[PDB]
Design an enzyme around this catalytic site. Structure first.
Site, PDB file in Angstrom:
ATOM      1  N   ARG A   1      84.584  42.867   4.655  1.00  0.00           N
ATOM      2  CA  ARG A   1      85.649  42.558   5.605  1.00  0.00           C
ATOM      3  C   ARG A   1      87.002  42.469   4.901  1.00  0.00           C
ATOM      4  NH1 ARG A   1      83.219  36.951   7.651  1.00  0.00           N
ATOM      5  NH2 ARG A   1      81.364  38.237   7.224  1.00  0.00           N
TER       6      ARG A   1
ATOM      7  N   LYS B   1      73.647  38.187  -5.149  1.00  0.00           N
ATOM      8  CA  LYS B   1      72.495  38.340  -4.276  1.00  0.00           C
ATOM      9  C   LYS B   1      71.234  37.996  -5.061  1.00  0.00           C
ATOM     10  CE  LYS B   1      74.670  41.934  -1.392  1.00  0.00           C
ATOM     11  NZ  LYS B   1      74.422  41.536   0.028  1.00  0.00           N
TER      12      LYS B   1
HETATM   13  O1  J4V Z   1      77.015  41.391   1.873  1.00  0.00           O
HETATM   14  C1  J4V Z   1      77.113  41.844   3.013  1.00  0.00           C
HETATM   15  N1  J4V Z   1      78.017  42.743   3.413  1.00  0.00           N
HETATM   16  O2  J4V Z   1      78.928  43.309   2.450  1.00  0.00           O
HETATM   17  C2  J4V Z   1      76.275  41.268   4.141  1.00  0.00           C
HETATM   18  N2  J4V Z   1      76.242  39.824   3.873  1.00  0.00           N
HETATM   19  C3  J4V Z   1      76.195  38.929   4.859  1.00  0.00           C
HETATM   20  O3  J4V Z   1      76.098  39.265   6.045  1.00  0.00           O
HETATM   21  C4  J4V Z   1      76.084  37.448   4.373  1.00  0.00           C
HETATM   22  C5  J4V Z   1      77.159  37.091   3.304  1.00  0.00           C
HETATM   23  C6  J4V Z   1      78.529  37.148   3.946  1.00  0.00           C
HETATM   24  C7  J4V Z   1      78.279  36.182   4.951  1.00  0.00           C
HETATM   25  C8  J4V Z   1      78.414  34.824   4.649  1.00  0.00           C
HETATM   26  C9  J4V Z   1      77.029  34.648   3.997  1.00  0.00           C
HETATM   27  C10 J4V Z   1      75.921  35.030   5.010  1.00  0.00           C
HETATM   28  C11 J4V Z   1      76.155  36.505   5.536  1.00  0.00           C
HETATM   29  C12 J4V Z   1      77.580  36.605   6.139  1.00  0.00           C
HETATM   30  C13 J4V Z   1      76.919  35.628   2.797  1.00  0.00           C
HETATM   31  C14 J4V Z   1      74.966  41.777   4.192  1.00  0.00           C
HETATM   32  C15 J4V Z   1      74.747  43.102   4.546  1.00  0.00           C
HETATM   33  C16 J4V Z   1      73.456  43.618   4.598  1.00  0.00           C
HETATM   34  C17 J4V Z   1      72.364  42.807   4.308  1.00  0.00           C
HETATM   35  C18 J4V Z   1      71.075  43.341   4.369  1.00  0.00           C
HETATM   36  C19 J4V Z   1      70.058  42.788   3.606  1.00  0.00           C
HETATM   37  C20 J4V Z   1      68.775  43.336   3.676  1.00  0.00           C
HETATM   38  F1  J4V Z   1      67.700  42.815   2.942  1.00  0.00           F
HETATM   39  C21 J4V Z   1      68.515  44.426   4.487  1.00  0.00           C
HETATM   40  F2  J4V Z   1      67.248  44.920   4.507  1.00  0.00           F
HETATM   41  C22 J4V Z   1      69.529  44.994   5.245  1.00  0.00           C
HETATM   42  F3  J4V Z   1      69.246  46.102   6.058  1.00  0.00           F
HETATM   43  C23 J4V Z   1      70.809  44.450   5.179  1.00  0.00           C
HETATM   44  C24 J4V Z   1      72.566  41.465   3.955  1.00  0.00           C
HETATM   45  C25 J4V Z   1      73.861  40.960   3.904  1.00  0.00           C
HETATM   46 ZN    ZN Z   2      78.403  41.816   0.512  1.00  0.00          ZN
END
Ligand code: J4V
Ligand code: ZN
Ligand code: J4V
Ligand code: J4V
Ligand code: ZN
Ligand code: ZN
Lengths: 514, 516, 509
Positions: free
Chosen positions: A374, A297
Site C-alpha cells: 500500500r 514473515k
Molecule cells: O504482505 C502482504 N502484502 O504485501 C499481505 N500482508 C497482510 O495482509 C498482513 C500484513 C499487513 C497487514 C497488517 C498485518 C496483517 C495483514 C495486513 C501484516 C499478505 C499478502 C498475501 C498473503 C498470503 C499468504 C499466503 F500464505 C497465501 F497462501 C496467500 F495466497 C497470500 C499474506 C499477507
Molecule cells: Zn507484505
C-alpha cells in the site's frame, strides 16, 4: 536498459522469457457441424452432455461423414457411458479408408449451460488426453452450447493448461493442428486469434510470476518491460531512483531502501492513432520479493517461500499491455504503471515506526513493514492521477485476508465510483475471470488517524484488512474514478503449483469494451 | 455381548462390518504368459517397462488371439505412449466377433526390479481404470518381472484398493468385475498365492473397517463386541474382561486411562490353538484406544490433529485382522493369544490427571507426566497380563509416538526389542509381507530420565526428545523375562493422501505367525 | 421446564426487564417553523457546516437570554467536527436554570448510520452526566424518516443501562424538526424497535449460567404468552423421534437438555407470505473437544453465540407488537450448549441429520452449522416461501467485513435483494457475499455423505454457507452471518444486531 547487480557472477542478469511458444504454431480450423465431421488423423473428442439427468447416457448427435465411425458412435454403443462432468473415454477403430482413428468424448455434465468453473474442468480432462500421447492433431466437436466468450475461454484455457513452462529445467511434442466443430462456425471464428492473444498475455504474466526473485528482481523486471514495449511499439519510460527522489516518492522509496536492487518505476503507454476519447491508468503492485521486512514473515503459514508472486499485479498489467499493443484498440490511451521494488531486511531497511512522506505531501506512520504494497501503491496512484486520466484501476496482491473472505476463486474489487466498479464487473463477466464487489466501509477510517503523522499505514484494531487497505489507498486519489482489485487470493494455483496469470484478461476486456 | 451405553437414542450401538465383499465373488485364473494371451473378453491391461530408456516408448511383445487388438498393439501405435511409472492409457474397440473390449497398459518405469512402493503406484493406476469400468473381466498381462511374494502383494493391494468402504454412506460409473485373468511366467507356481492373497486382503480390509469406523461407532464396548463376533465366526476361544475382573487383576495403569470415559474398559483376549502339538506360544498385543483426546493434556496444539484420533486403536485392528487370517489359514503347532486393553481417553470430572501416581498390575508405581502418553499405560498392564500367559514371544503393535513421523515417516514402521532373534524374525516377516519395518535402538543411556523422584518410574521423559526410544524403555520395564518386540505404527497407520486406513500390520503379523 | 442446578446457588431463570425508564418518556415533535421554546432541561442543536468549520445556529429561539448566547459571534468559538459537543448552564428569561448546547454533525450533508451513531453517543454522554427532566433536540440538519427513526432507537438503546447483575432518567423528550407531521408516526415505531433490540441485548448479555438452553426457552415461552403468539418447545424425546442427530450431537456433552424453540405469528386476515426465521442458539460455545484454547479464540465472549436466537426473539417482540398484515412467520431456534464432557460428541464422529444425510465432523467448534442444518430441515417442512437464518457462524466475518457490516449469502436473488433493501431502511448494514460452488468439492467426505468442514479451503464463511445450502432442497433461502457484528467491543456490550433488520424485512414484504 540497466545492468542487473550481482553478488556472485553466477547470479542471473535477466528473466528468461519464451515469446514463441508451441501453441503459436498450432493451426486452428473451425468448421460448421451442419457439414458433418471428418474423422481422420489424431484424436477427435466429442464434448457431450445430458441436460437434467445426472450421469445420463452419452449420445452423439453430430453427423460423422464415415460409415464405420458412425456405426461405432451409434446410441446403442454409447449408452454404456455417462456424461458425468469431466469423465472421459478413448475409442479406437478403423474408418472407411481402412485407417485407424482415435475418437473419444468428455462429459460436460447435466446442466445446460456450463460455468467457467465447469468448463475449466472440461478442459482439464481434455488436456489429460493430450498429455502422454504423441498426437499431431486434436479435433474437438461441440455438442454443447457455448456463447462466444465461453468458446474463447475454452480456447485460452486449453492453450494455457496444455503449455508447459520449462525455462528452469536443466537435467530434468505438441499437436500441430486443432480442428473445431461447432454450430454457426462463422460467428465464432473471430474468437480464435483473440483467444491466442489472450492466452499469451496470460502465459506471459505467468512466466514473470513463476520466475523466482533471484531471476525476477526490480531491475530485470523493468528490463523485461522495456523489451516488451520495443517489440510492441509502446512508449516507455523507466524512472530510476534519482528521478523518483525528485518526485519525492518517499513511500515507494522507503520500501525499497533495504534492497540491493535499486527501485524502478515502469511506465508504458499505448496511444490510439485516432482521436482519444478515453484515458486510463492501470496500476499493478510490483514487489519482486516480499520477505516482510523487519516485520519478517516468520509466523506459521506466512508462506515466505511463495512471495515471488507479490508482483502478480505488475505481471497482470504487463500481460494486459501485450494484449492491448497487439489487438490495438481505437479511441483510447492506456498507461501501464508499476512501482517495482523488493522488500528486504538490511541495515538500510525502513523500520517499523518510521514516519515517511508520500509524493503528495501526506506523512505516514509505518506500523508494519510487511504492509509495504500500500506504500508503493500510494505513490504510484499519485503519479497516475497527475497523468490526468478518466479511470485509475489498480490490481494487487494486497491482503492475505482475501483468503478468508472470497477464497482462491474470486478476486475482490473496491472503489470510489460505482460506474467504474460496474464496468469492472462487466469485464469480469466477459473475461470469465471472477470478481466480487466488496465495500469500502468509512466507519473504519478513524483507525487510520495517527497521533503524529497525517495517517496510519495500518489499523491497530480493525481486523478487516482488505477494507482498511482500500481506505488507505483511497486517501491518495483526490478526484478521479478509482478501483482496486485485490488478487492476493486468486493469483496462485495451489493445486497445480503454478500462477494463474490472473487479471490479464479481465483488464484487457475492460480496455476493449470501453 | 455387552450393551452399548448411549447419551441419546440416535447414538449407534454397533460397528457395521462387511464380511462378504464383492472381492470374494471375483473368479481368479492364472495363465502362463509363454502361450500368448486371449483378449476376446473384457478389459486387458499390459504391465510394461522400458529398461534403460527413461520415459521410453511402450512396446507390447505378447501374441494375442484377436487381429483387431493385434493391430491396436502394433509398435507404430503403441510408441505414441510412454512407460512413465503410473502412466496409463486404455481404449475401447470392437474385437473380431464385433464385441466390445478394452485394451491398455500401465507403465512400470525404466527399472527391471519393481519396488513394493512402485508396485502400489502401478496398482493404483490400474484401480483408477477399474473404478470407471463396467466390463465383466479384467485381464492383467505381466510383461515385467515379478516374484511370488511380489505377485501376491499385487493381488492383495489390488483387492484392497479396489474395494471401497460405503458403510456410512446413505458407483453409477463402475461395476465390480466377476473374473480376473493373469498372464505371467510360471503360472502354476503363482496359482497358490491367489487364495492366500484373498485371505490377507480381508484381514487387512477388516482392520481398515474397524479403524475407519468413527469413535461414536467404534467404542470399547462395540469393539469388544465385534471381536467376540469375529471369534465366533472362526471358532476361536474368547473372553472379554470387564472392570470388576480388571480391578481384581489390579490393572491400575490401564483402568486409570479409561476412568474419564462413559464407556467401561473392555479387555480383549482371543485364542487360537492348533489341533496338533503346541511348540510355540505367542502373544499379539494391540494398542486399543478407540479415541484419544489427550485427556487433560488435550490435543490442542497446532498439528496435533485431534480429528484423526479414532485411529489410535489401529494396533487393535491389526491384531484382530491377524486373528481373521490365522483362524482362517489354521497354522499347525502354535498357540497364539490376541490381546488388547481397549478404552477411551477423555476429559471429564472423572478423568485421571497429569501428576497422578498410579500402580500397575505388577506392583510398579508410575508418575503420570502427560495424560496424552496413555498408550504406554494401557500396554504396560497388557504386557504384564501377556507375560503371565507363559508365552515364548510377545509382540505389541501400536500407534505409540508422533515422533515416528520425524524418524521413519509414513512408509516404514519401527521395531524395538529386548531380543535379537525375535527382532530378526520380525524383519523377515516384514520382507515377505511387504509391510516395511526398520529396527531402531533402545538406548539404555536414556533410562535414567525415567527415574521419578516419587514413584517407581516416570511415564515420560522431561528432557529426552527421542520419544520412541523413551516409550520403549518404559514398556521394557513391564516385560521381565520374555522375548519381546514392539512395533510403533503411529507414522504409518493412516494414508493421508487417500484419506483412509492402510490396515498396516495384519499381513506382517500373520507372516510372523505362519513362517515361525 | 425445570432448570437443572449443580449447586443451590445456581440461577434458574434469566432476569428480564420489560418495563424500562425508556417506556416512561413522553415524546413530542414540533415543527421548527414557529420557533423553539427553551423553558426547562437541556436543549441541544444538531448542526453541521457543509470541514470542522464553525457552529452557526439558524433557528429562532423565543428567549432573549438564550438567543444572545446563540448569537453567531459567540458560537464561532466552536466547531462542528463530528461528535464534538459543548453545553452551558444559564438562566433564561424567567430565571429558570436551563442548559443549552450543540452536537456537531460534521461537514457532509447526508449522514450515514455510522455518523448518526456518533452524534447519538455524544448526546447520550451528556444525558448520563446531567440530572435532567427533559431533553430537547433541535434538528438543523436533513434526515430521512428512516434515519429519524434510527436516531430515536439508538438514543433510547444507548441511553438505557442494564443493571440486572449489579448489587434518574428524563421524563420528557422534545424534538424540533422540519415538517414535524411526517416524522410523528416514526416515534412509537422507534420505541418498539428499541425494546426489541434491548430485549435481544439482555439475553445476549446474560451469562451462560443464567441463560442456558432451558432458561432461554423458558423466556421465549414467557415472551410468547405476553404477546399471545402460538408457541411450542420441542424436547429431547421429540427431537429424537424427528431424528435430529446433528443438533442432538452438539448438545450431548451439556447438563442442559436441548430445547428447540418454535413461535408463530399469523396476521389477521388473508395471508400472502409465509416466512421462517431461524436463529443460531448456542448459549455457550466452549468449542467442544476442539476447545477454544488458541490465542484470540476469546472463549469468554462465547455466551454471545446465541445472538441469532436473540435476534429472532427480539423480532418476535416487534412483529408481535406492530402486528403487520398478510404474513405468517415462524420464529425458530435449535437451542443447546456446546461442552466438554465424557458425553460429548467427538471430532471424527459421523452423525445423521434429520433429512438422512450423514456428516463427518472435522471440528466440534463448528457446531453452529450442525444445529442449523437440522433447524433448516425442520423449517422447510413448514411449507414457507422464505427461510432466513441469522447466526454468529464464522469468525472469518471479522476478516472480511469487520465489526460494522454483516454478510448475507443465499440461493435466491430476489430474497437477497429484499434483505439488502431491509438493511438500508433499518440502517443495520449488510453486504452480499457469494456462495461459490467451486468449493463444494471439499465437502466431499470419504466416508459420510458430506463433510462438516473443509480441510483445505480457507474461505470459512462461504464453505459454511455451502454446507447449510445442502439442507434446503427447494425453498428461497438466505443466511446472515453476524459473528463479527454482534458484539460491540468498545462499549463492552451487545448490539442486539438483526432485530430491526428482520422486522423491516417482515414489514416491507
Ligand atoms: O504482505 C502482504 N502484502 O504485501 C499481505 N500482508 C497482510 O495482509 C498482513 C500484513 C499487513 C497487514 C497488517 C498485518 C496483517 C495483514 C495486513 C501484516 C499478505 C499478502 C498475501 C498473503 C498470503 C499468504 C499466503 F500464505 C497465501 F497462501 C496467500 F495466497 C497470500 C499474506 C499477507
Ligand atoms: Zn507484505
Ligand atoms: O498421543 C499419543 N499416543 O496416545 C502420542 N503422543 C506422543 O507421542 C507425544 C505426547 C506423549 C508424549 C509426551 C509428549 C510428546 C510425545 C510423547 C506428548 C502420539 C501418537 C501419534 C501422534 C500423531 C499425530 C499426528 F498429527 C499424526 F499425523 C500422526 F500420524 C500421529 C501424536 C501423538
Ligand atoms: O465457533 C464458531 N462457530 O460456532 C466459529 N469458528 C470458526 O469459524 C472456526 C472453527 C470452526 C471452523 C473449523 C475451524 C476454523 C473455523 C471454521 C474452527 C467462530 C465464530 C466466532 C468467532 C469469533 C471470535 C472472536 F474472538 C470474536 F471477537 C468474534 F467476534 C467472533 C470465532 C469462531
Ligand atoms: Zn495420546
Ligand atoms: Zn463453535
Amino acid at each position: 536498459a540497466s545492468e542487473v547487480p550481482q553478488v556472485v557472477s553466477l547470479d542471473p542478469t535477466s528473466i528468461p522469457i519464451e515469446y514463441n511458444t508451441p501453441i503459436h504454431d498450432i493451426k486452428v480450423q473451425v468448421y460448421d457441424i451442419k457439414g458433418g465431421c471428418n474423422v481422420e488423423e489424431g484424436l477427435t473428442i466429442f464434448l457431450v452432455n445430458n441436460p437434467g439427468k445426472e450421469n445420463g447416457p452419452v449420445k452423439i448427435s453430430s453427423k460423422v461423414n464415415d460409415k464405420q465411425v458412425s456405426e461405432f458412435l451409434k446410441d446403442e454403443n454409447m449408452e454404456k457411458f455417462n456424461v458425468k462432468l469431466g469423465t472421459s473415454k478413448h475409442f479406437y477403430m478403423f474408418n472407411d479408408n481402412k485407417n485407424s482413428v482415435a475418437v473419444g468424448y468428455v462429459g460436460c455434465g447435466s446442466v445446460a449451460d456450463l460455468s467457467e468453473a465447469d468448463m475449466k474442468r472440461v478442459v482439464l480432462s481434455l488436456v489429460t488426453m493430450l498429455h502422454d500421447n504423441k498426437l499431431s492433431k486434436l479435433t474437438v466437436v461441440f455438442e454443447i452450447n457455448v456463447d462466444k466468450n465461453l468458446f474463447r475461454f475454452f480456447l485460452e484455457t486449453l492453450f494455457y493448461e496444455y503449455m508447459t513452462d520449462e525455462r528452469f529445467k536443466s537435467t530434468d511434442e505438441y499437436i500441430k493442428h486443432l480442428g473445431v466443430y461447432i454450430n454457426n462456425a462463422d460467428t465464432y471464428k473471430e474468437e480464435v486469434e483473440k483467444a491466442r492473444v489472450y492466452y499469451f498475455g496470460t502465459y506471459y504474466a505467468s512466466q514473470l510470476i513463476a520466475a523466482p526473485s533471484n531471476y525476477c528482481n526490480p531491475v530485470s523486471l523493468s528490463n523485461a518491460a522495456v523489451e516488451l514495449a520495443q517489440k510492441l511499439n509502446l512508449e516507455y519510460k523507466i524512472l530510476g531512483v534519482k528521478e523518483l527522489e525528485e518526485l519525492k516518492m518517499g513511500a515507494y522509496l522507503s520500501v525499497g531502501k533495504g534492497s540491493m536492487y535499486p527501485n524502478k518505476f515502469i511506465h508504458l503507454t499505448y496511444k490510439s492513432k485516432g482521436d482519444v476519447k478515453k484515458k486510463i491508468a492501470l496500476v499493478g503492485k510490483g514487489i519482486t520479493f516480499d520477505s516482510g521486512g523487519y516485520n519478517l514473515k516468520a509466523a506459521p503459514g506466512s508462506m515466505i517461500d511463495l512471495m515471488k508472486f507479490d508482483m502478480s499485479g505488475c505481471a497482470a498489467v504487463l500481460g494486459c499491455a501485450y494484449c492491448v499493443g497487439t489487438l490495438k484498440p481505437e479511441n483510447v490511451e492506456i498507461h501501464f504503471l508499476s512501482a517495482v521494488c523488493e522488500n528486504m531486511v538490511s541495515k538500510n531497511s525502513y523500520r517499523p515506526g518510521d514516519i515517511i512522506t508520500a509524493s503528495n505531501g501526506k506523512t505516514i506512520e509505518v506500523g508494519n513493514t510487511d504492509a509495504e504494497g500500500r506504500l508503493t501503491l500510494a505513490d504510484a496512484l499519485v503519479y497516475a492521477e497527475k497523468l490526468g486520466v478518466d479511470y485509475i484501476v489498480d490490481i494487487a496482491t494486497l491482503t492475505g485476508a482475501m483468503l478468508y473472505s472470497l477464497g482462491t476463486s474470486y478476486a475482490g474489487v473496491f472503489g470510489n465510483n460505482e460506474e467504474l466498479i460496474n464496468k469492472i464487473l462487466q469485464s469480469s463477466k466477459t473475461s470469465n475471470e471472477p470478481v466480487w464487489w466488496l465495500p469500502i466501509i468509512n466507519e473504519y477510517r478513524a483507525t487510520l488517524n495517527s497521533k503524529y503523522a497525517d495517517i496510519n499505514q495500518i489499523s491497530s484494531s480493525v481486523k478487516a484488512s482488505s477494507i482498511v487497505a482500500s481506505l488507505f489507498l483511497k486517501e491518495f486519489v483526490q478526484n478521479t474514478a478509482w478501483a482496486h482489485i485485490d488478487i492476493a487470493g486468486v493469483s496462485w494455483n495451489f493445486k497445480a503449483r503454478k500462477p494463474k496469470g490472473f487479471g490479464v484478461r479481465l483488464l484487457t476486456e475492460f480496455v476493449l469494451n470501453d
